Design a protein around this motif. Structure first.
Motif: not given
Length: 15
Positions: A1-2, A11-12
């Motif tokens: 992810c950016r 992300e998590k």
């Protein structure tokens, strides 16, 4: 992810 302010969150949780 950016690497946004919600990098960690993206992300998590959102893959």
């Amino acid at each position: 992810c950016r690497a946004g302010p919600l990098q960690w969150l993206c992300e998590k949780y959102f893959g």
